[PDB]
Design a protein around this ligand. Structure first.
Ligand SMILES: Cc1cn([C@H]2C[C@H](OP(=O)(O)O)[C@@H](COP(=O)(O)O)O2)c(=O)[nH]c1=O
Ligand SMILES: [Ca+2]
Length: 129
């Protein structure tokens, strides 16, 4: 897997973000993550977390996995990094996302996110409180 550049166009919610990728606007959906929706519990807090992460970042990178790069809605499927820090994994660490939607061609950082989820749970953070 390799990182590729991109630039924030706009925060959207906890687990989607609009980026410019190879010169083209594109809604990206975070592999391996499920944040609550805005109108659900911890939804505002998940949206806020992702937003600040991406808005403060000096460098946004996109990392595709081995399989499906676009979902059926035309959303890009990737790991996103904010100044070298994985947004997908960081949500899970803080108990603001669950590990979810783990399909076989696209699960490279599964064990890593599972490890973070276990530790969010131990601390009973946010969603696990
Ligand atoms: C994260 C992810 C979601 N999806 C699809 C499955 C879900 O389909 P359905 O919409 O048919 O339920 C939807 C969940 O996205 P949201 O959690 O953004 O709603 O996006 C993928 O196909 N691959 C993925 O890797
Ligand atoms: Ca969601």
């Amino acid at each position: 897997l390799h990182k590729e550049p991109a630039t924030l166009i706009k925060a959207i919610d906890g687990d989607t973000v609009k980026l410019m990728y190879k010169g083209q606007p594109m809604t990206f959906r975070l592999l391996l993550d499920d944040t609550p929706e805005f109108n659900e519990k911890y939804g505002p807090e998940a949206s806020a977390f992702t937003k600040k992460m991406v808005e403060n970042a000096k460098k946004i990178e996109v990392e595709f996995d081995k399989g499906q790069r676009t979902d059926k809605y035309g959303r890009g499927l990737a790991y996103i990094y904010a100044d070298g820090k994985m947004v997908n994994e960081a949500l899970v660490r803080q108990g603001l996302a669950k590990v979810a939607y783990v399909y076989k061609g696209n699960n490279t950082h599964e064990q890593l996110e599972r490890k973070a989820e276990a530790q969010a749970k131990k601390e009973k953070l946010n969603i696990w409180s």
